[PDB]
Design a protein around this ligand. Structure first.
Ligand code: HDD
Ligand code: HDD
Ligand SMILES: [Ca+2]
Ligand SMILES: [Ca+2]
Ligand SMILES: [Ca+2]
Ligand SMILES: [Ca+2]
Ligand SMILES: [Ca+2]
Lengths: 675, 673
């Protein structure tokens, strides 16, 4: 509603100033036709002042990201576990807006950097805006919010030269990770495929912190939020991610945009783990510690409702850039915990909007407005867009008949702090000793990945640590990695020419947990939206016919098909010059195009070797690949015909049926070497 | 540093607040060891408030860039042509700060996007700060500053979804270009290798506009600024730039930073073309039109002095992010012209600093301060750092004895407007008809490029225009291109499966001009700083030995050598896993590593792909040690190719290879239409 009221249509009409005076804006007013521009040209100055002031500070973290509208629908009346109004009835719908992001990069940095990712969700509830400001990884680097600028200074570019962009592959970051062992768990997640998701739709969301569900009788339970993807879990490989950062920095935002435009809006089951207050230390670690997960073997997930994103913004700046999330946007039926990471966040997100917005009335921007009436005695401030009719904005008053009325647990559906909560003890700047195991869970996570996934994680660390210049930092990194796993430390040390420290088995173990592996999570549950590149030629009308035949068969099943040839024409979407294997989830060469794949093939229309390099890159990166028409191509690529995920069929139908199974498998991991 | 007065050392001492109270900053204050955080924790709040407020708006354009300090030295007393103090004596030195940039991308976008580039120079003169806010292309897309938001909206990402980053390769940009034909000249420059320079040190800087030099006696002449690189002109190739944008988004800033750190700070001759006022229309176009160059054949360059950058910043945000350039930072001896693009800039750069700084005292930031006293009656404002002793800040006054005194042509070395300038006519919002030829100069430029360079430009256009979804926009683009060159139109049209319109010869010609070609600009004058990747192996102790010997011989000549192998050790800089051909200007394989040409330590095929990419992209490549055929045959690289080297002798190999680094690119490796 606040959005619809502020939509501005410029599909017709004459140009006006911001005060509705019709004007022009194409030629400056000058003293003669070859003369100096005049100060009295208000048309020039208003247009250029606006331009000059377009930009606002980027977000201090998560500067790079993209958003969409949708709806949350409750599966049930959840009154038995929370008073939350948005959860109080089967089928109850609440509008949402979600923004997804990286963490370290500035605006304009690439989507496919290796990083932690944001997953921030606003529920415009009938009892106020409720935000769950989460990440795609369920644990955080640090245990106390006061350390956030340390973490973030260390990962962001070195501040003398501002190098490197959007990367932890520098001395300072690994200096911090090695000195602050709490970082191990999130580190291991970021060095897995969770640091390079295939799309925002193929990752989960996590609140990280323990929160409370509070009932209308005052009782509480402890919860963790999990948003579980209905699209499946999928990652890129690092070598692919690096090329994609160059070829399409906008890959995740375009994937989102496109999925929504085609009627394939992504979905998640909004879930919780729910445990009793008495179980704060029962699972072998402290539920106040944001570097720990509750293994699902100890507390299963309950599905609360469906999150669907199905509408793109109208103006990115107004909606996506200006959305201002806060964990302080809480509603009756939810409460905080004493997680010292959460506790400090509550301060930060209120304060930082003053930086972004430049003034205190940021909740008035349409994307930040609620969908219920606002009744309070907040007044004035720069940018004040309301005209308040209550001329006695103080409590207690008689002159406004004691309105607005105080809301609390007893009346008015007020927020209230869970009334069972207490504090006791000295006023301290001390870390709880219950937070001191920094290594067991990183090992739990590592144990739960498949062998090739473990290899990819090792290889990520090998990559990044080999770029650390400091020999001491690199030694200190091995010291910490060795506390998680001696084998990781040895394997990583081998790439950097150092020896690993001797095994220290204090935290070693062989326990695993379900639901953290990407490679182990089975085939994708849908292939709709996945991209197939068909490599063809204009030389041979046979090639274009085969391509068209595959197109119809793949499109029917919701795949996005790109036919690539030397030059554009009817049925060809993309020239070889602009094509890359990073643009596809699977690649098919029509056998009529075989000539383009020869070592001597050359054209002024694309770079030498491009058609073959698309095919070979796709294969090396694990993708389903094949040749359709029943040979030259598989041999030019040194691609084995018997390999899993390599397809070779004369029959278009048999080809598509086999090829679509391989898109669901998504990645053929047998093509990656192990230690 | 020139900013040493403002430096803060933290190499010793105990943590303090901003008001000097010693504190801690690692644990929050809590009501109990597992308790909630306390509002009274001022340590937490001051630290997190600062964090929360670290960011400032990026620049509205040229958001992505990097800078360095240096010195300008005059070659002579230029009293003959300008009263400018910084140019008034042979050997006179003035500190400078320079920022280079792209145009369209935000912060964090890649250095090697295809774009126009900024080259902004501040001279901290003894008569005030003087800025030349230029680009690496000598002409601008548009003819009136009022149009700047239109250009920039069209080239920046589409505003519904903010896609694409740092790119003209989208419908809106090509829509604007094809509807505003003024854009042709800059567009051809940007679609040339001038859109993807090899480094900031391998590009020139241009003021674009005609300015005036003004002597103390009031007379004036018309000038164009040219800063001509002493490193040579060089570009990337587009495939290479695309990969490099992913592998190293910081490539230009690192190149610069490393050059300075190694004592190879980049140099430019600061030059002008100098013509009489009576020549404003004499060259076949109007000197007020920023879409035109004065061909060097009509007005030669005069060298004024030397620009050398030789000191990197101490704090990037404080120095580079905060530097606030303005064309209104002008000094006695220089004046403006009635170029309608320049005229409107003067407003923009003073105003925009209010957005960036959040208040009016942005000239007090250390990087913005002048190196001479300030005497004026500007007062107050947020962030005011000065404590003014004059309590009568108005003119005219008696109560401060009439100080500060007015400065003008005749007293106090004042700035003064060139007194021969006049204006005549109606007050109009009309374009001079003298601006109307949008197409001849683009053709002049295109004609001046070599054949392969012409092909690269065609190829950049084919790449971008093929991404334009609108058939109508594509057709309109072909219409404009065809007015520059029919052949360009035909060759671009072929890629996008449309027919070019028939020849329209109104603006066609065969004239050329010197100094605009990159490919034609001959070997580089220096190879110092250029990057040689030596691909080796740890399996064979002789391969490491070969690499060490090559390293020695190459480093002697000031090349930056990287030895690559499977794993790090003594003498090996980089693993195959982190290496890429975009990291090198030439690639050498030692023949002890020939067996590499699969492993858990690097992606399949990586060693050979580095060599093959390097060859495909034009670089000098070769095999040192005598046995070349196994590597060269694996690569499909012909032993007899130009810029392909095979020698057993390390000296012979390096002597040959260095000639190839100076040639820089072997253009025979690219197909022509
Ligand atoms: C004490 C400070 C602090 C700490 C410990 C954290 N953050 Fe935060 N976060 C910020 C301070 C902050 C911020 C500076 O206040 C940002 C920048 C922009 C904004 O609105 O808030 C932010 C932004 C931000 C966003 C982007 C929201 C958007 O798309 O606009 C996400 C997703 C997160 N954070 C998620 C997390 C998670 C899951 C954390 C740990 C569980 C976390 N942050 C800890
Ligand atoms: C009407 C406005 C307008 C017009 C016509 C131009 N510019 Fe500009 N330019 C700006 C308005 C602007 C600005 C909005 O004022 C910026 C953003 C940051 C700043 O300080 O000024 C800017 C920044 C900016 C910078 C970055 C300086 C730095 O590194 O901080 C360079 C190099 C240029 N411009 C160069 C040019 C050149 C060579 C132009 C034409 C000859 C040009 N601009 C026309
Ligand atoms: Ca660093
Ligand atoms: Ca993976
Ligand atoms: Ca567009
Ligand atoms: Ca402000
Ligand atoms: Ca004057």
């Amino acid at each position: 509603s606040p959005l619809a009221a502020y939509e501005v249509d410029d599909s017709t009409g004459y140009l006006t100033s911001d005060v509705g005076g019709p004007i022009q804006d194409q030629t400056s007013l000058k003293a003669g036709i070859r003369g100096p521009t005049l100060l009295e040209d208000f048309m020039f100055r208003q247009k250029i002042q606006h331009f000059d002031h377009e930009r606002v500070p980027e977000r201090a973290v998560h500067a790079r990201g993209a958003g969409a509208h949708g709806t949350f629908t409750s599966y049930a009346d959840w009154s038995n576990i929370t008073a939350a109004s948005f959860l109080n009835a089967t089928g109850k719908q609440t509008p949402v807006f979600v923004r997804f992001s990286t963490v370290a990069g500035s605006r304009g940095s690439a989507d496919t950097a290796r990083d932690v990712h944001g997953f921030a969700t606003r529920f415009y509830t009938d009892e106020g805006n409720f935000d769950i400001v989460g990440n795609n990884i369920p644990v955080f680097f640090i245990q106390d919010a006061i350390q956030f600028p340390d973490l973030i200074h260390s990962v962001k570019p070195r501040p003398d030269n501002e190098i490197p962009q959007a990367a932890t592959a520098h001395d300072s970051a690994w200096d911090f990770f090695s000195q602050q062992p709490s970082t191990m768990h999130t580190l291991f997640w970021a060095m897995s495929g969770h640091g390079i998701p295939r799309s925002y739709r193929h990752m989960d969301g996590f609140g990280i912190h323990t929160f409370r569900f509070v009932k209308d009788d005052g009782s509480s339970k402890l919860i963790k939020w999990h948003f579980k993807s209905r699209q499946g879990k999928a990652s890129l490989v690092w070598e692919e991610a690096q090329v994609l950062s160059g070829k399409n920095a906008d890959f995740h935002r375009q994937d989102l945009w496109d999925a929504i435009e085609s009627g394939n809006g992504p979905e998640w089951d909004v879930c919780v783990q729910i445990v009793d207050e008495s179980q704060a230390q029962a699972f072998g670690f402290d539920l106040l510690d944001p570097t720990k997960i509750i293994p699902e073997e100890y507390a299963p997930l309950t599905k609360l409702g469906l999150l669907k994103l199905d509408r793109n913004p109208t103006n990115y700046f107004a909606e996506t850039e200006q959305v201002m999330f806060q964990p302080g946007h809480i509603v009756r039926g939810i409460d905080f915990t004493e997680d010292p990471l959460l506790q400090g966040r509550l301060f930060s997100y209120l304060d930082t909007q003053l930086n972004r917005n430049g003034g205190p009335n940021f909740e008035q921007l349409p994307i930040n407005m609620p969908r219920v009436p606002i009744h309070n005695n907040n007044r004035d401030g720069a940018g004040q867009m309301f005209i308040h009719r209550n001329k006695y904005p103080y409590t207690p008053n008689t002159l406004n008949s004691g309105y607005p009325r105080q809301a609390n647990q007893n009346a008015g559906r007020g927020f209230f702090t869970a009334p069972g909560r207490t504090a006791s003890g000295a006023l301290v700047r001390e870390v709880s000793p219950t937070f001191n195991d920094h290594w067991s869970q990183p090992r739990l996570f590592f144990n739960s990945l498949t062998p090739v996934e473990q290899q990819f994680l090792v290889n990520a660390m090998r990559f990044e640590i080999s770029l650390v210049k400091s020999e001491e930092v690199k030694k200190n990194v091995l010291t910490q990695l060795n506390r998680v796993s001696h084998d990781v430390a040895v394997r990583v040390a081998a790439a950097i020419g150092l020896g690993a420290p001797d095994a220290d088995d204090t935290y070693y173990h062989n326990n695993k947990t379900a639901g953290v592996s990407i490679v182990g999570s089975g085939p994708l549950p849908t292939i709709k939206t996945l991209r197939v590149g068909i490599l063809a030629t204009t030389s041979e009308s046979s090639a274009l016919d085969q391509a068209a035949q595959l197109r119809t068969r793949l499109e029917k099943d919701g795949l996005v098909v790109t036919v690539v040839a030397e030059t554009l024409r009817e049925g060809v979407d993309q020239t070889y010059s602009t094509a890359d294997a990073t643009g596809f989830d699977g690649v098919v060469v029509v056998d009529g195009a075989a000539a383009l794949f020869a070592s001597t093939a050359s054209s002024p229309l694309f770079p030498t070797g491009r058609p073959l390099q698309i095919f070979v890159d796709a294969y090396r990166w694990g993708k389903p690949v094949g040749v359709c028409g029943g040979s030259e191509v598989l041999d030019a690529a040194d691609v084995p015909e018997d390999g899993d995920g390599v397809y070779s069929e004369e029959s278009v139908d048999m080809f598509v049926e086999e090829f679509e199974k391989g898109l669901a498998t998504f990645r053929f991991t047998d093509r990656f070497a192990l230690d």
